Amino acid sequence: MNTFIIFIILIPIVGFALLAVNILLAVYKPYNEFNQTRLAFNAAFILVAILFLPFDLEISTLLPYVMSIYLVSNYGFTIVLLFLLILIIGFVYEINTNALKINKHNKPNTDSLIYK
Amino acid sequence: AIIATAFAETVKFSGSKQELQKRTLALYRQFLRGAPTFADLYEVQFSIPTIRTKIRQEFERHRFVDDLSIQNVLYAKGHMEYQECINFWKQQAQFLKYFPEEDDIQGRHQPSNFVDKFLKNRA
Amino acid sequence: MPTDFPLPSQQKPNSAVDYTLTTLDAVANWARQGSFWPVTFGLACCAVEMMHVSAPRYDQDRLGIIFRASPRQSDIMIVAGTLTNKMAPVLRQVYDQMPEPRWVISMGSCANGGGYYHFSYSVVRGCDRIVPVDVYVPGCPPTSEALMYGVFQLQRKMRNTKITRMWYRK
Amino acid sequence: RPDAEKRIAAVLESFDKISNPAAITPTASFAKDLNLDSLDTVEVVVAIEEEFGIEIPDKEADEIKSVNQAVEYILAQ
Amino acid sequence: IRAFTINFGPQHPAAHGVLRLILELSGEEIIRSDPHVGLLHRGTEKLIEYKTYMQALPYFDRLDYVSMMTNEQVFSLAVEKLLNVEVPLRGKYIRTMFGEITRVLNHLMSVCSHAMDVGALTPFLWGFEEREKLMEFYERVSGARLHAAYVRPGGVSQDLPAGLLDDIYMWATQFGDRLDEIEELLTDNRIWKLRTVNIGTVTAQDALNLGLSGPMLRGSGIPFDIRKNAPYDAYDKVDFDVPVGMNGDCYDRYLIRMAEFRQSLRIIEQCCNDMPAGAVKVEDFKINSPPRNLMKEDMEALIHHFLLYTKGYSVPPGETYTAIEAPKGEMGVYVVSDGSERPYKCKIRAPGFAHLGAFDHIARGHFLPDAVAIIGTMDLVFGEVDR
Amino acid sequence: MIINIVEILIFLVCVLFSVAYLTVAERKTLAYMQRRLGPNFVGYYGLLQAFADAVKLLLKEIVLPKESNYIILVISPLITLITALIGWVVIPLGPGITLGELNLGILFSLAIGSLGVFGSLLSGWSSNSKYSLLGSIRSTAQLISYELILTSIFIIIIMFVSSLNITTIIETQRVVWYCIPLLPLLLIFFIASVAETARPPFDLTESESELVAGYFTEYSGSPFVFFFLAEYSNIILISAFNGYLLLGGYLSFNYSYLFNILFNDYSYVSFLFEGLINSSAYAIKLVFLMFSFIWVRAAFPRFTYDNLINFCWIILLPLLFGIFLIIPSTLYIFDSFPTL
Amino acid sequence: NSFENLAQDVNITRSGKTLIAKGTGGRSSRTGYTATVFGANGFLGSYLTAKLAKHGTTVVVPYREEMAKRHLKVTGDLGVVNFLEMDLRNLESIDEAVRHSDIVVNLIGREYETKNFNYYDVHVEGARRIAEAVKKHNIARYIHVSAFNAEIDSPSEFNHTKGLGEQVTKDIVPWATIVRPAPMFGREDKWFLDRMARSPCLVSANKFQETSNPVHVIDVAAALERICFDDSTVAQTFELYGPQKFTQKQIIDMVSETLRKEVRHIELPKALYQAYTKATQAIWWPTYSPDQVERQFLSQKIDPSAKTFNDLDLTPMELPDLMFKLIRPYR
Numbered sequence A: 001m002n003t004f005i006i007f008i009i010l011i012p013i014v015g016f017a018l019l020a021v022n023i024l025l026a027v028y029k030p031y032n033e034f035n036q037t038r039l040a041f042n043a044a045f046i047l048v049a050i051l052f053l054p055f056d057l058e059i060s061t062l063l064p065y066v067m068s069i070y071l072v073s074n075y076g077f078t079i080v081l082l083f084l085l086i087l088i089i090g091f092v093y094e095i096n097t098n099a100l101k102i103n104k105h106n107k108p109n110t111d112s113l114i115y116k
Numbered sequence B: 001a002i003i004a005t006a007f008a009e010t011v012k013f014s015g016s017k018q019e020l021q022k023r024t025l026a027l028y029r030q031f032l033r034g035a036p037t038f039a040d041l042y043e044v045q046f047s048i049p050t051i052r053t054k055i056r057q058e059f060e061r062h063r064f065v066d067d068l069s070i071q072n073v074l075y076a077k078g079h080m081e082y083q084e085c086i087n088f089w090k091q092q093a094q095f096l097k098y099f100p101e102e103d104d105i106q107g108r109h110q111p112s113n114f115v116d117k118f119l120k121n122r123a
Numbered sequence C: 001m002p003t004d005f006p007l008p009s010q011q012k013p014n015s016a017v018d019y020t021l022t023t024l025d026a027v028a029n030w031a032r033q034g035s036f037w038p039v040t041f042g043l044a045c046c047a048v049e050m051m052h053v054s055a056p057r058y059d060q061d062r063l064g065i066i067f068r069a070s071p072r073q074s075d076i077m078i079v080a081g082t083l084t085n086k087m088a089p090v091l092r093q094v095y096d097q098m099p100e101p102r103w104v105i106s107m108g109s110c111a112n113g114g115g116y117y118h119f120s121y122s123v124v125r126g127c128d129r130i131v132p133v134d135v136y137v138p139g140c141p142p143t144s145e146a147l148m149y150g151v152f153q154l155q156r157k158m159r160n161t162k163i164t165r166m167w168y169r170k
Numbered sequence D: 001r002p003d004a005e006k007r008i009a010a011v012l013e014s015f016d017k018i019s020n021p022a023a024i025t026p027t028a029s030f031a032k033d034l035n036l037d038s039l040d041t042v043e044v045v046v047a048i049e050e051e052f053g054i055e056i057p058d059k060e061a062d063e064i065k066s067v068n069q070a071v072e073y074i075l076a077q
Numbered sequence E: 001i002r003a004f005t006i007n008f009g010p011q012h013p014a015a016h017g018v019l020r021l022i023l024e025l026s027g028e029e030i031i032r033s034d035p036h037v038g039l040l041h042r043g044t045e046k047l048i049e050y051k052t053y054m055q056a057l058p059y060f061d062r063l064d065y066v067s068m069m070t071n072e073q074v075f076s077l078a079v080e081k082l083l084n085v086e087v088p089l090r091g092k093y094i095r096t097m098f099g100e101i102t103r104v105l106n107h108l109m110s111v112c113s114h115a116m117d118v119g120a121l122t123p124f125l126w127g128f129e130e131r132e133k134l135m136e137f138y139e140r141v142s143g144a145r146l147h148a149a150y151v152r153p154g155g156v157s158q159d160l161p162a163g164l165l166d167d168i169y170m171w172a173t174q175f176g177d178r179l180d181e182i183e184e185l186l187t188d189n190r191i192w193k194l195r196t197v198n199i200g201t202v203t204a205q206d207a208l209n210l211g212l213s214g215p216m217l218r219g220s221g222i223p224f225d226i227r228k229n230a231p232y233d234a235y236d237k238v239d240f241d242v243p244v245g246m247n248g249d250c251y252d253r254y255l256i257r258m259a260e261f262r263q264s265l266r267i268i269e270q271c272c273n274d275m276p277a278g279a280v281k282v283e284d285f286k287i288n289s290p291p292r293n294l295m296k297e298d299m300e301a302l303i304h305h306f307l308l309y310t311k312g313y314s315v316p317p318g319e320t321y322t323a324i325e326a327p328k329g330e331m332g333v334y335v336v337s338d339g340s341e342r343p344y345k346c347k348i349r350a351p352g353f354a355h356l357g358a359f360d361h362i363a364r365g366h367f368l369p370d371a372v373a374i375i376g377t378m379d380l381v382f383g384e385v386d387r
Numbered sequence F: 001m002i003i004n005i006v007e008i009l010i011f012l013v014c015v016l017f018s019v020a021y022l023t024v025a026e027r028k029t030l031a032y033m034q035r036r037l038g039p040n041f042v043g044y045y046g047l048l049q050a051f052a053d054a055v056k057l058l059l060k061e062i063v064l065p066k067e068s069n070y071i072i073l074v075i076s077p078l079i080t081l082i083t084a085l086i087g088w089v090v091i092p093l094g095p096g097i098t099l100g101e102l103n104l105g106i107l108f109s110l111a112i113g114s115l116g117v118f119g120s121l122l123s124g125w126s127s128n129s130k131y132s133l134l135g136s137i138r139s140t141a142q143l144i145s146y147e148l149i150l151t152s153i154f155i156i157i158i159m160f161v162s163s164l165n166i167t168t169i170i171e172t173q174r175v176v177w178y179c180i181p182l183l184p185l186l187l188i189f190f191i192a193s194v195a196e197t198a199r200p201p202f203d204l205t206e207s208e209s210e211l212v213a214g215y216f217t218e219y220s221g222s223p224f225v226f227f228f229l230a231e232y233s234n235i236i237l238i239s240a241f242n243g244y245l246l247l248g249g250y251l252s253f254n255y256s257y258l259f260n261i262l263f264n265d266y267s268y269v270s271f272l273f274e275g276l277i278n279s280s281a282y283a284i285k286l287v288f289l290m291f292s293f294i295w296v297r298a299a300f301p302r303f304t305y306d307n308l309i310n311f312c313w314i315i316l317l318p319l320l321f322g323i324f325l326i327i328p329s330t331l332y333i334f335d336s337f338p339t340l
Numbered sequence G: 001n002s003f004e005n006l007a008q009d010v011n012i013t014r015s016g017k018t019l020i021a022k023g024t025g026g027r028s029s030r031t032g033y034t035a036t037v038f039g040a041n042g043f044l045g046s047y048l049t050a051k052l053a054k055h056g057t058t059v060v061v062p063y064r065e066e067m068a069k070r071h072l073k074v075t076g077d078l079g080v081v082n083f084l085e086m087d088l089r090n091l092e093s094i095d096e097a098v099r100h101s102d103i104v105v106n107l108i109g110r111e112y113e114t115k116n117f118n119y120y121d122v123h124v125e126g127a128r129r130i131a132e133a134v135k136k137h138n139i140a141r142y143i144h145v146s147a148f149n150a151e152i153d154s155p156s157e158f159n160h161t162k163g164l165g166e167q168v169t170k171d172i173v174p175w176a177t178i179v180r181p182a183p184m185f186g187r188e189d190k191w192f193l194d195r196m197a198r199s200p201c202l203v204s205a206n207k208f209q210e211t212s213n214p215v216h217v218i219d220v221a222a223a224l225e226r227i228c229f230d231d232s233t234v235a236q237t238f239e240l241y242g243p244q245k246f247t248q249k250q251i252i253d254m255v256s257e258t259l260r261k262e263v264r265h266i267e268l269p270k271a272l273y274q275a276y277t278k279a280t281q282a283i284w285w286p287t288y289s290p291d292q293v294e295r296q297f298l299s300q301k302i303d304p305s306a307k308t309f310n311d312l313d314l315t316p317m318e319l320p321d322l323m324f325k326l327i328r329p330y331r
């Protein structure tokens, strides 16, 4: 009866009124109209989402802190700042290991013309 | 452009008739092995042994050439058409050049005698 | 059934049903006229002129023309430039994956009847031999003024589409 | 492999240009006994490897001149 | 075993061109490439052996359809070198500054089309607008737009209008503002500078081994230009700096194109001040038409006017290779005269032909969006490469 | 029951009827940004054309590729559309005027934007071509990677608020805005704002040149209006987020000094005019912001994907942790801790 | 490029007009036959005038709608295919469309009644209206088509009226040549394979045992063109039946074994079956007909006294040979 609950229910029916309007209004639905071996990757595709989970997760970890921050005066500060200062060096692990470098093997042949 | 494509070879001219014959035999084996790939790739209407009985008779067309080097140009052209068909480089419209006779039975009054040539003054 | 009946080129609305159908037809043809999505097919000396229509002298966005270069969203196709033997199956395939209320317009003189390459070996003698083209845009540099005029010719044909009036089978 | 040459005979029978399908003995020469050609050779050999799905190198394909040599080769898998 | 190799563009990958282009991607890294060209291949060379040089001229503004006038120029130069004739002074300057406004047009199309291919939309319209202003300047001289029935193998088709030489100066004063304006959002431009800092390096000796030329070879560092190395057409008589790049990157190949606007405008400043007077065609009536004033009055002018339009003019036997500096690169042409009035044979050296041929020596290792920035700065218009 | 079903319809014609003329407005802008005229043939001053776009688009067919599960190509358009449409509850429109006020505003506001990735990842899986799949991969990885920092500044905003109700933030923001103290926050938020939308300073993934004619799926029809409208709803939805939690949400100035001059008493005219001016301040911020998105869409080329991930994790996000070390510290220097 | 169309080169037609097929038979050539195909936008008509214009006979195409008329231009050269609009109603348009036609066919058959046309309209009345003008103009080689099971009897009003149209064609211009083909199958046929390709229900009566032998459509078109031009076809009824009689269970199992899917089966009886099809007429896109109900209890009644494919030196193909091709893209 509240318009809040009406809002999330009416919009799928609005989407249905936009959905079946093509099936009502179209015609000629479907006329007559190699992938043998490979798939290719680097770690820079697969790693971003997997590493994304703790950095997404820590926001929801930090989220109960920011509501209650007046209660934890000068001390929950100290605890959360220790928590962050663990996580930040956890971050600067990867940037020194260059975990999102997707480096190219287009090297200009460093080795010179040693001859004879 | 240091490097070639997948199946392309450096062209090289066999000094003997036997070495040419060895290369042609390996080549017909390559067509015959890749023939079921073609019906998948070019999505053709018909069956694989029809492809095979064409690939046989096309070399039957050139079984009786004397020269070494005319068979050498002939082998090079055959290798290039293999190179085309093993990839997506020809398309199925261009792939179905090789069967004009299969897809349509010709039509009424195919001229055979003198008279059927004559009544349409040899077409 | 009546032995005499007016031709659909010559008929006028007389029933109130026909006024309703004609105005609904006008709305459908009108949205088809304004929004107007060709596909970038252009390939040769006949493609820079297609870009000259997108240039800020002879704008097409003020006409509603925009190049969704993706043939499933395209209403029509502008065959532009010459058409070779080696390409033509791709032209047929791009024509295939288009939605049904489609047209195709032959920009350029090579695109109809071969043009300047009518006697070459590896050339299609105009894109008649591939797709059914409804408007030709002549001109070997087929003028932006002429190309737009071809679009307006096609839009007049679009005004005479009669998609609604044919349900009454006039 | 037992009865493998039976399957080899089953594949070999399905061709043409064979004046006797009952001339398929385990010691049948391709060019001589079966009356085959140089193209028939790799025809039947590719038919064999297609019957098994195995793939073969070029020289071991080239040297098989009799079905005895085919049954000699057959236990590479 | 091989990569899941793709077809790059059937229709509209790179604007102004059908770039069918095989790529083998292993990490979104090109291990090798193979562009199949031939999709525009009309077979024009087989045709041009069957028409007279008189008629054979508008084959070539169809070739390289963004810079028509250099093609017109290079065939006129090949035939004038072959015929042992000399275009007069007025003809030299008028062909020179049209071959430089066409350079302005070519870089104005190419840089902006490349910026659209990358994604910068604003020069793709700001440049084509000034290209329409130059369409007008093709229009007053010769026929319609974008395909000029112009410079003849005798020289020039006809004179200017009465006031184009004035009017082009009114344009030329404001082209500088309209050029520095597009320079202001692409040259510093940390996005563009990131995308184009070392992308597709082209070393010196490998630039020579791939036969490349024009802005690419001058970007790699070698100071080579046909306007100043083997000069012609009073490029001697017009002062003209040339830019030369430092790295082998695409950024030098960008910056040199930005520079050549500034250079070819200075061409127009030194041309419009010092356009001489004199005969605009060649002096005689035996390789091009007499003017239509006096052919209705003179008996001698008719037979020339007739034989040049039935037979055409007769060429001494021989063969030439004349190559000049198109804004794409060194465009060459190799004509073999029968001694008849049809050319017995005529090869073109389209400039982008070797540029496309040098693709997968440069494009190895780079990324697939990086495999677009490499495209339109070797300028594959594809009207050139096949023919 | 009667006055709420009209309360939702007026909001619909306030938003859904406006997002179409947004797509007309972008053409008008990019016309004058590139020195040409906008649409002028279609309406009176060339308005309305999004209707002519949609009605034509509703008349084209439902051609479907053979490799696609058709149900999946029904689900992803619908759910991306309704995600960017049920993000419209606790936009505030004046004081406390939302569709449904609830004390956890930002959490809904942010979890539905978190649902925003889920359609675009699902969409490229239908028509399972290898390029079509790996394009969905490349899109979704940036689409989560800046969804991080989009999420991740929302907590430092409410380090001045400490309350999840959205309309509480603006009444906190009456004394001063948040953008004018925290200026570089706005810059990194603006680039993070155009990141989670498909915008081409950043949307390389709609490269038709790279794919076999593929933008996302080329799936068109009344399917095509769905992701399209969802995209342009996403545009001014993230504009709305930018509006309240970073800029002056519905606030313009004091305007009580003006009112005591004008009225003598509360009346429905007074509520009308005050709701007008609060909505108009919200409107003018929102309408400058939708213009700014185009104003950055025009002037810049696209990226490399390497550039895009380098742009997330190396250059932006350690600076974000620097914010996480300076703003609790600045909170700690003074007493200054916010209470609900 | 040879004339595999004709027997010969020089042909005077039956009405006395001289026709000389100059050139060598390709697309650019001309044959000389001015042909007219009514309803050519239909599924038989596209394949028909494709082969008819393949050798450059001038094909006069009357159309009804301006959109579907367009994809028949591509099978003809300049002047080969021509277009003109007409209704079945307006007799002057019939009169106009056949003025110079050497030969003419009418594949006008609509399986459902509109609100403006019934079976009595478009089968027995309109055919009278057009072949009256054929008699008025002495047009040679008139061909009329009717369906299989074209009786005088009741139970399908369609089939009741098809034989009525046959009798009218035998009555006026009485030498008219009547052809009755079998059920037809081709790439996107009307109701026989694409209905069986995708179907959310797949319900019909009879428990799937009505019998016929379907013919591939291109074989019908080649058969028709080989009829079109020679002698020994005049005033002769033509049964055109496939090589081997089938049942519906056999057909649908042959479809589903290549689809490798479970084609649904409901097979509910006639009573509830009819009233659902009654309500579908008010919808503008065509649905399964309430008179297509009746033909499900009917089967292929072959007349033995007619002339087959082997009259004209043709052997059509068998459906099992074609099943992989035609419903390939639904795999």
Ligand SMILES: NC(=O)C1=CN([C@@H]2O[C@H](COP(=O)(O)OP(=O)(O)OC[C@H]3O[C@@H](n4cnc5c(N)ncnc54)[C@H](OP(=O)(O)O)[C@@H]3O)[C@@H](O)[C@H]2O)C=CC1
Pocket (backbone or CB within 6 Å): G038, G039, G040, G041, G042, G043, G044, G045, G063, G064, G065, G068, G087, G088, G106, G107, G108, G109, G110, G117, G122, G145, G146, G147, G148, G180, G181, G182, G183, G184, G185, G190, G192
């Ligand atoms: N298996 C089968 O389907 C069988 C069919 N037949 C008959 O063969 C012929 C063609 O077969 P098929 O392709 O399947 O059917 P069609 O699709 O061809 O039938 C409709 C065609 O006839 C036209 N038509 C119908 N009524 C009218 C009308 N009042 N005015 C103008 N045109 C009209 C249609 O016009 P428009 O183009 O505008 O739609 C269309 O061209 C038909 O006559 C059919 O009865 C015989 C045996 C087997």
Ligand code: SF4
Pocket (backbone or CB within 6 Å): C044, C045, C046, C080, C081, C082, C107, C108, C109, C110, C111, C115, C116, C139, C140, C141, C142, E062
């Ligand atoms: S119309 Fe003209 S410019 Fe275009 S392809 Fe033909 S000849 Fe070339």
